[PDB]
Amino acid sequence: RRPWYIQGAASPKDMLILVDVSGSVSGLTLKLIRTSVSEMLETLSDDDFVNVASFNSNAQDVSCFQHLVQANVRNKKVLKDAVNNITAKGITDYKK
């Protein structure tokens, strides 16, 4: 998880994190998904681009960003604070 290792191990990325916020994830798995998305955002550098979306019978951006942003410390702060506010309710629709 060191910056030099991640930087020398693979080329930059256009990551989109698609999170499942349907009802079935409520409880332990939603808390684990929040911690997991934070730890996944911590493996990204300033040459990578990221956005976190969220779907349950309807897909929407989880934050104020609306597209891929530069994945620097401020944008990742925003995405983490927006992920930690997720609540689980609805039907699961993978196609959307």
Partner 1 sequence: WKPFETIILLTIFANCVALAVYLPMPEDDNNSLNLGLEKLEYFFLTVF
- The tokens describing 40, both together, are 């996944």
24 in a known ligand binding site: yes
d(CA 18, CA 71): 16
Does position 7 interact with partner 1 (CB under 8 A)? The reply is no
Does position 91 interact with partner 1 (CB under 8 A)? The reply is yes
By CB under 8 A, the residues from 18 to 37 that bind partner 1 are 22-24, 26-27
Residue 22 CB, nearest distance to partner 1 (Å)? 5
Is the CB of residue 24 less than 8 Å from the CB of residue 92? yes
48 in a known ligand binding site: no
What burial class does residue 54 get, using C-beta atoms within 10 Å of its C-beta: 0-12 exposed, 13-18 middle, 19+ buried? buried
Which residues contribute to the site for partner 1 (CB under 8 A)? 22-24, 26-27, 88-92
Residues making up the binding site: 20, 22, 24
